[PDB]
Design a binder for this molecule. Structure first.
Ligand code: CLA
Ligand code: CLA
Ligand code: CLA
Ligand code: CLA
Ligand code: CLA
Ligand code: CLA
Ligand SMILES: CCCCCCCCCCCCCCCCCC(=O)OC[C@H](CO[C@@H]1O[C@H](CO)[C@H](O)[C@H](O)[C@H]1O)OC(=O)CCCCCCCCCCCCCCCCC
Ligand SMILES: CCCCCCCCCCCCCCCCCC(=O)OC[C@H](CO[C@@H]1O[C@H](CO)[C@H](O)[C@H](O)[C@H]1O)OC(=O)CCCCCCCCCCCCCCCCC
Ligand SMILES: CC1=C(/C=C/C(C)=C/C=C/C(C)=C/C=C/C=C(C)/C=C/C=C(C)/C=C/C2=C(C)CCCC2(C)C)C(C)(C)CCC1
Ligand SMILES: CC1=C(/C=C/C(C)=C/C=C/C(C)=C/C=C/C=C(C)/C=C/C=C(C)/C=C/C2=C(C)CCCC2(C)C)C(C)(C)CCC1
Ligand SMILES: CCCCCCCCCCCCO[C@@H]1O[C@H](CO)[C@@H](O[C@H]2O[C@H](CO)[C@@H](O)[C@H](O)[C@H]2O)[C@H](O)[C@H]1O
Ligand code: OEX
Ligand SMILES: [Cl-]
Ligand SMILES: [Fe+2]
Lengths: 82, 340, 32, 447, 35, 335, 137
């Protein structure tokens, strides 16, 4: 009923754990926050910002229409201030 | 030999068993789950479906999804380093590259997982009836997420990984395939619904035919983890159902195999039906019915009623559900009943 | 012809039900 | 005192079955939670309440309960003074501390058992005399309460009557129906379409009157149970244990929960459409009205208009000949309402009144109730499932009905569960089949 | 016993725990984006 | 005779009957026999029914052009609504069959009997000295029949809107429901499939695990089932070997070792899930529908950015716009 | 793709003169439009009379012209039929009938202008959607 690993109960209870994780856990959180709040996430995944779905006048959708020249076609969609 | 030493290490009894299978399972399984959780929050479906599909855009747990690639892509594998994305990651995301990522990876993850079942069973020295059972969920994933779109025009018509994105996959199959009218599908639900019955009825039967092996009311503690006597009266259970239902089990070994057969057989039947929907070889109509309905304007069944619902589904959904077709349906051509 | 076919199978299932319940194999205890 | 050697943690409250003292603490602490909610919620509702705006458009379910009793409202359900709402809220909220106090006390300080610290309050589940006596007590307390309503209605102000002659207004009932033939007649009414059983009450005279009867009958049976014991049949039929008694009361609440669901959904009188929303039928009726009103002004003869099916676009006949509204609204021809009745004749909707007696207040009433049907989504988006986000609204009649059905149902399960255990507890096998003496093994084989 | 620290379990746990909170932090920030 | 009535009560309650006709049985057996007989006759030979009360008869019987898949017993007319419509309420049987008379006779008899069927599932458990609560598990499928045949009609104000008694008729009930209530986007329904998927899952889980960990007592060319005799003392499978395997499949503490904790979970999950799905239909019977995320996410200018929820709405519109063609005369469907 | 003041420029009166609303006014109008209009005029339609919508074109061919701030505002005080040959304040929400329509009691001239502006700005943004019904959903 037991193996080499240190019983979670002990670790989650050990003061040393929290001394570590009161730093680590919030760190990742603030990191993830900055990833979004700095608009970096938008560029990493090409996700459009609220003002970047259409052009001002245009009401059409930037649908990719061919596989091989898709990447080129996509960049062309960003051109029209989209 | 290094091999047997590598073996030794892998097959070591840890908290989370690795094993040879683990070399295939864990990488894929993690990337599959990761790819979804990634796209779910960050990646969009604008350039592929004209849809918002991430938390970053404002979608919630229900409306989020990792949408299929464009219809332009075809059945392209959409490799990160392929002709489409051309090594680019951002482009890859915007072309729905994460879908083929989740799909293909997850697929092998399901392979590794069944392999794990096989490998672990062998070691423990138990029968692999856990691996045989797991074949049904495989067939479904294979038939639905791979075989089906492979029969259609592209990956675009595969079910997108997401809650709402699956609901439309249901409504689509109704509208276009009349999927509910398919015999293979009927067997499907018959297995799942009947399987969810066996699960319920057997558990309740056992808990309420138990022997008294303790002095407390909470009889949970009063169980012997080390086999010995049967914890519940199989004989009493027999006489019970034999008098309320007329029929009853009397062979635990059959009763449990039956609990394996029913739901596994069901999912397999539902798979075959989907395999037929790939070639669009659906069970849409009854020729005898249509012929009378044409000649006779007063002939109406619940079957005729349903088809009218399908026509409505197809007409009103197709435009925004199939952007690549550039559909334009004038108000006057839209099929409508009275008032509504 | 079709109606006849549908009722027939149905009638056969009900017949089976009968035999299944009242003409089953007697469930014998221990010494089986 | 009580631990694992009694029940499991997840069945903890069952360790108190034989601890009268602590078991009293629970019921008193619990009763505080009910008063607490009623109080704190009322103040919550009032804090958001907007006077010059319909109550049903504000997610109110307590303030309209007060409004019905003739408090802070006037002509047409117009909100006059918000003070009675504030009072009812704060008074409750206060009493919750008092109850909560005793609750906490009896459960962790006071006597763990009562039988010794007071033989009057101490009790035995199998003591058929004490049980019917304690029951007799509550049977009176509830009885006086029923008269508390009668008093408010006849003396201390009255109730909101939507059927008010000059139009919906607070009225003092000074003529309660006391005729038993009429009163108890309701119980002999069908529960289906038309004859609506208890829910079919359509005037406050019966409401007040009925409560007079209940009030007396309740106290009467209260005294009866004080001064008696269960008979012969009464003892050989029921199961006498702490759990059994619970079960009996569980199914009782379940049944009342179902009745309440239909009441808030169908009844117009004791659930005013002015404070609550328009009832389901009322809203569909209003649409028929609205467009009958419109098209007629365009010069259409509603009487002879032929719909697609050839049934009657605006007006048709009921299965018994009465003139009713057309369309799918044919199912709600059993609807009665203040705004609609003046158009009704001895044979149903009168074509002459319809043609030139339509009043403006009726037209906008029909328009109002039509655009406020009890249709909405879980996330509170008024309309059909295909509607667009804009109108944040879900009729109070919808909230109440659905909530109280889930509760009512689960209580019917709670019933089955606790009644099934009690029968097994009494006879003594609620803990498993006797390995030695297995009953089934002593019965002949049916095979 | 003298338990170790870094183990295979430790690795596994972190492969899920570390990204999770990073995502939970990311999503939490999204609740304030507008237009 | 010890006493006629006393003997009567002893025969009914007798546990020596091939089929336990209980006290609930005294109501069950007649009601169910009436239900089934009328059904069988209707499904085969019943004439078309004006379900929507718009004088537009829908034939759902075999003899009238239907097959098993299409055939159904058509709900009572919408002109009747929630009114009670017994045979003795009609000028003739011809009128009774036209207005969907049989439907009420069936559903009422069924729901009554099916309720007593639950009541009987307690009684026999009582007479045999076994624990009850089996009927409590049967309360979930029963509460669904109630929700579908009685609760939804009450809420909607007509029995014509109750689920038809047939295959294709059942499909119609769903498609239309989805349109008007968007059931797929409702939590209770989602919990329903969770119990149902999970059920079939767990049913396969348990089934496989047990049958795979059977103690060897059979030949190589002999059915592994014969390795069990009806009325055994000891267990027929190694539950400790089962836990050993499944414990390694995921991880030890995520595996059951208590057979009683197992079968409880095996029973609890589907029953609870179906309970909610039953409450779903009963809740949406008062038009408290699923989540409405139509036109939720919009861009910086105000343009509507569609989601899958919007794609669902289009499909729903098609159903709405097309269902019950000639039944509607007014813009809003509020009935 | 944003709500520019170029978009928030709607006709003030019949004589061509225009007015430019602010993002504060828009939001305020939009909120007020939900408060006292959405009930019947959700998405620019009219539930109690589908024959007349809130399309700019429809408001233009009205009598008097209601396709400008002044027009709509007048309507919100003294509403008429499409030909204007009949006052309908008794069965339609308005200032001179706030006793009958309590929602209109709070509403001040600032609110009226905001609501009026909203009706003119929405079609500029939504387009065909604003006018049509379920078809364009
Ligand atoms: C064992 C685990 C495993 C497996 C089976 C896969 C499998 C796959 N991954 Mg993958 N991946 C893994 C782990 C794994 N991954 C890990 C841990 C990561 C994180 C770094 C990734 C990250 C990742 C990304 C980012 C992508 C994939 C993709 C893919 C798919 C296409 C890859 C391909 O073309 O294979 C190629 C197969 C091989 C290279 C095997 C070759 C083995 C031979 C024996 C070696 C011979 C070499 C020699 C020089 C040949 C000489 C011949 C001479 C003529 C030149 C495929 C399903 C792609 C995908 O999903 O596209 C949609 C994709 O874009 N993977
Ligand atoms: C008047 C109402 C009433 C009363 C007084 C009791 C009293 C009792 N019940 Mg009970 N019961 C009731 C109604 C009632 N029941 C109903 C309606 C049902 C049907 C669901 C049940 C089902 C039930 C079962 C299945 C069992 C009991 C048991 C018991 C006994 C032990 C109490 C216990 O287990 O607490 C423990 C309490 C809990 C563990 C709390 C449960 C929390 C619930 C399930 C969640 C509620 C959801 C909530 C609204 C959402 C909150 C959101 C959250 C994030 C905060 C006790 C005598 C037990 C017993 O020993 O039988 C005799 C037992 O096994 N009851
Ligand atoms: C309505 C809810 C309710 C109520 C009134 C009670 C009441 C009670 N439970 Mg209980 N219980 C409940 C829900 C409830 N339970 C649920 C949902 C569960 C499942 C998780 C349990 C599980 C459970 C177990 C397992 C046991 C009890 C026991 C008891 C009894 C003794 C309490 C005790 O040990 O004090 C201990 C008190 C404390 C440790 C301090 C708690 C602080 C107090 C009580 C709350 C203060 C309230 C408020 C903030 C103060 C207001 C003050 C103001 C008026 C001035 C008591 C009658 C025990 C029993 O059988 O009695 C012998 C027992 O063993 N309960
Ligand atoms: C049970 C009766 C009842 C009814 C009919 C209402 C009705 C209402 N409440 Mg209300 N409320 C209640 C009890 C009730 N409340 C209680 C007990 C509390 C104290 C917590 C509150 C606190 C409260 C607040 C703070 C507010 C309301 C508001 C409202 C209104 C808006 C409804 C809404 O949006 O909710 C939608 C709610 C949901 C969709 C949540 C549904 C939760 C379900 C029941 C969970 C079921 C899961 C199940 C239990 C899981 C267990 C299974 C497990 C054991 C396996 C509406 C009139 C709002 C209002 O007035 O604004 C206009 C408001 O702000 N209520
Ligand atoms: C369900 C309600 C209820 C019940 C049955 C009891 C029962 C009991 N309490 Mg008690 N208590 C309660 C609520 C209740 N309490 C509340 C809410 C509080 C908080 C204020 C207390 C605080 C409390 C304390 C501090 C003490 C008790 C004690 C006792 C015990 C001795 C009897 C006693 O003190 O009465 C004596 C009083 C009377 C016999 C007459 C009281 C009449 C009051 C003043 C009028 C009540 C009016 C009522 C609301 C309307 C009813 C009239 C209507 C029919 C027309 C007894 C078991 C004592 C104890 O533990 O001893 C064993 C003790 O020291 N109680
Ligand atoms: C909720 C309050 C309440 C409760 C719990 C009780 C409880 C009890 N009363 Mg009772 N009683 C009450 C109020 C209450 N009383 C009132 C207010 C009065 C004054 C009218 C009486 C007058 C009274 C008398 C005169 C007698 C009792 C008796 C009894 C005991 C046996 C009951 C029995 O076997 O009935 C079981 C009932 C039946 C077997 C009959 C079933 C047929 C029912 C009535 C019709 C079907 C019900 C249906 C589902 C509901 C539809 C509604 C209907 C109108 C259509 C029991 C302890 C008896 C006793 O033991 O004396 C001490 C007794 O002789 N009661
Ligand atoms: C492939 C598998 C990948 C596994 C990745 C590691 C997962 C880490 C999980 C640790 C949880 C743990 O050990 O159990 C935490 C505790 C077990 O407690 C164990 O106690 C032991 C005593 O010697 C030791 O202290 C162990 O360290 C401690 O974990 O939970 C259990 O009792 C059973 C947990 C079963 C959880 C199943 C998933 C259900 C989750 C519920 C969420 C729904 C909300
Ligand atoms: C009230 C009366 C209710 C009447 C109910 C009628 C019950 C139907 C009986 C079915 C025959 C059962 C049978 O052959 O297996 C009878 C056997 C009983 O015999 C079993 O034999 C096995 C092989 O040796 C093992 O030994 C089992 O222990 C032993 O019990 O039952 C099973 O094991 C199968 C259980 C599943 C039963 C099927 C569900 C019935 C669903 C019918 C749906 C068809 C509807 C068609 C409608 C048109
Ligand atoms: C794609 C990709 C990749 C991958 C990545 C990864 C792998 C990631 C991961 C990620 C992750 C891994 C994430 C996670 C997340 C998570 C989350 C975010 C969670 C959340 C949760 C929640 C929210 C919860 C809730 C709940 C429940 C569910 C139950 C009940 C209660 C509660 C409420 C608590 C790579 C780079 C390789 C390559 C490229 C591409
Ligand atoms: C036993 C027990 C329990 C229970 C408990 C209870 C149930 C309690 C209760 C309690 C209570 C029941 C309490 C109450 C309280 C109250 C109070 C304390 C009140 C107050 C009030 C006030 C203060 C008022 C004032 C005001 C006003 C008038 C207005 C404005 C604002 C205010 C609010 C301020 C538990 C489960 C936990 C555990 C176990 C044991
Ligand atoms: C088992 C098989 C697992 C294989 C996993 C391979 C994953 C790495 O995948 C690798 O990603 C890198 C970027 O990271 C791509 O690299 C691409 O982008 C980089 C810059 O970012 C360019 O300089 C490069 O020319 C281009 O190919 C590679 O073309 C692809 O091969
Ligand atoms: O019936 Mn069937 O469908 Ca419930 O909704 Mn209204 O009425 Mn009719 O319309 Mn849709
Ligand atoms: Cl239809
Ligand atoms: Fe089992």
């Amino acid at each position: 009923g037991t193996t080499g690993e240190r019983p979670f109960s002990d670790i989650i209870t050990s003061v040393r754990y929290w001394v570590i994780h009161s730093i680590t856990i919030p760190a990742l959180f603030i990191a993830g926050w900055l990833f979004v709040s700095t608009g970096l996430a938008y560029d990493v995944f090409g996700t459009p910002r609220p003002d970047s779905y259409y052009a001002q006048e245009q009401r059409s959708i930037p649908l990719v229409t061919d596989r091989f020249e898709a990447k080129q076609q996509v960049e062309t969609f960003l051109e029209q201030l989209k | 030999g290094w091999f047997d030493i590598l073996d030794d290490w892998l097959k070591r009894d840890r908290f989370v068993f690795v094993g040879w299978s683990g070399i295939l399972l864990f990488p894929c399984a993690y990337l599959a789950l990761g790819g979804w959780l990634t796209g779910t929050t960050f990646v969009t479906s604008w350039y592929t479906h004209g849809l918002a599909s991430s938390y970053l855009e404002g979608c919630n747990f229900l409306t989020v999804a990792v949408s299929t690639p464009a219809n332009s892509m075809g059945h392209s594998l959409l490799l990160l380093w392929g002709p489409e994305a051309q090594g680019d990651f951002t482009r890859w995301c915007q072309l729905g590259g994460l879908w083929t990522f989740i799909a293909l990876h997850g697929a092998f993850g399901l392979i590794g997982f069944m392999l794990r079942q096989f490998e672990i069973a062998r070691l423990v020295g138990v029968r692999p009836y856990n691996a045989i059972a797991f074949s049904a969920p495989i067939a479904v994933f294979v038939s639905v997420f791979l075989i089906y779109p492979l029969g259609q025009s592209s990956w675009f018509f595969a079910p997108s990984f997401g809650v709402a994105a699956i609901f439309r996959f249901l409504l689509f199959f109704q509208g276009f395939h009349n999927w509910t009218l398919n015999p293979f599908h009927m067997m499907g639900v018959a297995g799942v619904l009947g399987g969810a019955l066996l699960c319920a009825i057997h558990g309740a039967t056992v808990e309420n035919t138990l022997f008294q092996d303790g002095e407390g009311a909470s009889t949970f503690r009063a169980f012997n983890p080390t086999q010995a006597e049967e914890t519940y009266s199989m004989v009493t259970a027999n006489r019970f159902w034999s008098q309320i239902f007329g029929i009853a089990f009397s062979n635990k070994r059959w009763l449990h195999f039956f609990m394996l057969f029913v739901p596994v057989t069901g999912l397999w039947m539902s798979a075959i039906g989907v395999v037929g929907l790939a070639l669009n070889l659906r069970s849409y109509d009854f020729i005898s019915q249509e012929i009378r309905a044409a000649e006779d304007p007063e002939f109406e069944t619940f079957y005729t009623k349903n088809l009218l619902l399908n026509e409505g589904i197809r007409a009103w959904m197709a435009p925004q559900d199939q952007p690549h077709e550039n559909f334009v349906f004038p108000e006057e051509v839209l099929p409508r009943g009275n008032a509504l | 012809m079709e109606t006849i076919t549908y009722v027939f199978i149905f009638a056969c299932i009900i017949a089976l039900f009968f035999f299944a319940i009242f003409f089953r194999e007697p469930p014998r205890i221990t010494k089986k | 005192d009580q631990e694992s050697s009694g029940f499991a943690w997840w069945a903890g409250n069952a360790r108190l079955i034989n601890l009268s003292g602590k078991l009293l603490g629970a019921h008193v602490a619990h009763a505080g939670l009910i008063v607490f909610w009623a109080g704190a919620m009322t103040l919550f509702e009032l804090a958001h309440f907007i006077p010059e705006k319909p109550m049903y458009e504000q997610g109110l379910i307590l303030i309209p309960h007060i409004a019905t009793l003739g408090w802070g409202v006037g002509p047409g359900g117009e909100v006059v003074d918000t003070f009675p709402f504030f009072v009812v809220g704060v008074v409750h909220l206060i009493s919750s501390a008092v109850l909560g106090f005793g609750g906490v006390y009896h459960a962790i300080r006071g006597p763990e058992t009562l039988e010794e610290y007071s033989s009057f309050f101490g009790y035995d589940w199998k003591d058929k005399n004490k049980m019917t006596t304690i029951l007799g007590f509550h049977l009176i307390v509830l009885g006086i309460g029923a008269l508390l309503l009668v008093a408010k209605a006849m003396f201390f102000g009255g109730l909101y009557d939507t059927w008010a002659p000059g139009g919906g207004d607070v009225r003092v009932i000074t003529n309660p129906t006391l005729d038993p033939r009429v009163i108890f007649g309701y119980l002999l009414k069908s529960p289906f379409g038309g004859e609506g059983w208890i829910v079919s009450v359509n005037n406050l005279e019966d409401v007040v009157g009925g409560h007079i009867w209940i009030g007396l009958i309740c106290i009467a049976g209260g005294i009866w149970h004080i001064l008696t014991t269960p008979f012969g049949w009464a003892r050989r039929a029921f199961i006498w244990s702490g759990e059994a008694y619970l079960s009996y009361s569980l199914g009782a609440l379940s049944m009342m929960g179902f009745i309440a669901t239909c009441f808030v959904w169908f009844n117009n009188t004791v659930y005013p459409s002015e404070f609550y929303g328009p009832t389901g039928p009322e809203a569909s009726q209003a649409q028929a009205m609205t467009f009958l009103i419109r098209d007629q002004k365009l010069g259409a003869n509603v009487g002879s208009a032929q719909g697609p099916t050839g049934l009657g676009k605006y007006l048709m006949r009921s299965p018994t000949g009465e003139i009713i509204f057309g369309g799918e609204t044919m199912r709600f021809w059993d609807f009665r309402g203040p705004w609609l009745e003046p158009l009704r004749g001895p044979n149903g909707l009168d074509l002459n009144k319809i043609k030139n007696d339509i009043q403006p207040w009726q037209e906008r009433r029909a328009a109002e109730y039509m655009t406020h049907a009890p249709l909405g989504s879980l996330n509170s988006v008024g309309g059909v499932a295909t509607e667009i986000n804009s109108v944040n609204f879900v009729s109070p009649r919808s909230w109440l009905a659905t909530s109280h059905f889930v509760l009512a149902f689960f209580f019917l399960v709670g019933h089955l569960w606790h009644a099934g255990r009690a029968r097994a507890a009494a006879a003594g096998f609620e803990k498993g089949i006797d390995r030695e003496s297995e009953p089934v093994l002593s019965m002949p084989s049916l095979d | 016993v003298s338990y170790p620290i870094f183990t295979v379990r430790w690795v596994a746990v972190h492969t899920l725990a570390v990204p999770t909170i990073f995502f939970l932090g990311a999503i939490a920030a999204m609740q304030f984006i507008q237009r | 005779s010890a006493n006629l009535w006393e003997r009567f009560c002893n025969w009914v309650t007798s546990t020596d009957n091939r089929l336990y006709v209980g006290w609930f049985g005294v109501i069950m057996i007649p009601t169910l026999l009436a239900a089934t007989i009328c059904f069988v006759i209707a499904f085969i030979a019943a004439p078309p029914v004006d379900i929507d009360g718009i004088r537009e008869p829908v034939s759902g019987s075999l003899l009238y052009g239907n097959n098993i898949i299409t055939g159904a017993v058509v709900p009572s007319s919408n002109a009747i609504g929630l009114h009670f419509y017994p045979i003795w309420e009609a000028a003739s049987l011809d009128e009774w069959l036209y207005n969907g008379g049989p439907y009420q006779l069936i559903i009422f008899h069924f729901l009554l009997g099916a309720s007593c069927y639950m009541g009987r599932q307690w009684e026999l458990s009582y007479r045999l000295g076994m624990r009850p609560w089996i009927c409590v598990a049967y309360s979930a499928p029963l509460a669904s029949a109630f929700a579908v045949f009685l609760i939804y009609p009450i809420g909607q104000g007509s029995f014509s809107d109750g689920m038809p008694l047939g295959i294709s008729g059942t499909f119609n009930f769903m498609i239309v429901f989805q349109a008007e209530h968007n059931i797929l986007m409702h939590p209770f329904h989602q919990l329903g499939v969770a119990g149902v998927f999970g059920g079939a899952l767990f049913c396969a889980m348990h089934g496989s695990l047990v049958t795979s960990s059977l103690i060897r007592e059979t030949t190589e060319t002999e059915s592994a089932n014969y390795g069990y005799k009806f009325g055994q003392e000891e267990e027929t499978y190694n539950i400790v070997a089962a836990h050993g395997y499944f414990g390694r499949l995921i991880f030890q503490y995520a595996s059951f070792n208590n057979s009683r904790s197992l079968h409880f979970f095996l029973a609890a999950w589907p029953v609870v899930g179906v309970w909610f799905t039953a409450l779903g239909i009963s809740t949406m019977a008062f038009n408290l529908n699923g989540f409405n995320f139509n036109h939720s996410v919009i861009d910086a200018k105000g343009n509507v950015i569609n989601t899958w929820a919007d794609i669902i709405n289009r499909a729903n519109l098609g159903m709405e716009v097309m269902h019950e063609r000639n039944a509607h005369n007014f813009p809003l469907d509020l009935a | 793709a944003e709500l520019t003041p170029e978009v928030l420029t709607v006709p003030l009166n019949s004589e061509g003169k225009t007015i430019t609303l602010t993002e504060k006014q828009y939001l305020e109008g939009k909120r007020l439009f939900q408060y006292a209009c959405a009930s019947c005029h959700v998405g620019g339609i009219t539930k109690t009379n589908p024959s007349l919508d809130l399309r700019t074109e429809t408001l233009a061919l009205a009598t008097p012209p209601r396709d400008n701030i002044e027009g709509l505002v007048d309507y919100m005080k003294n509403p008429t039929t499409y030909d204007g040959e009949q006052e309908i304040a008794e069965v339609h929400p308005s200032l001179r009938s706030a006793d009958i329509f309590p929602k209109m009691r709070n509403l001040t001239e600032k609110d009226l202008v905001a609501i009026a502006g909203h009706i003119l700005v929405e079609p500029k943004i939504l387009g065909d959607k604003w006018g049509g019904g379920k078809v364009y959903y």
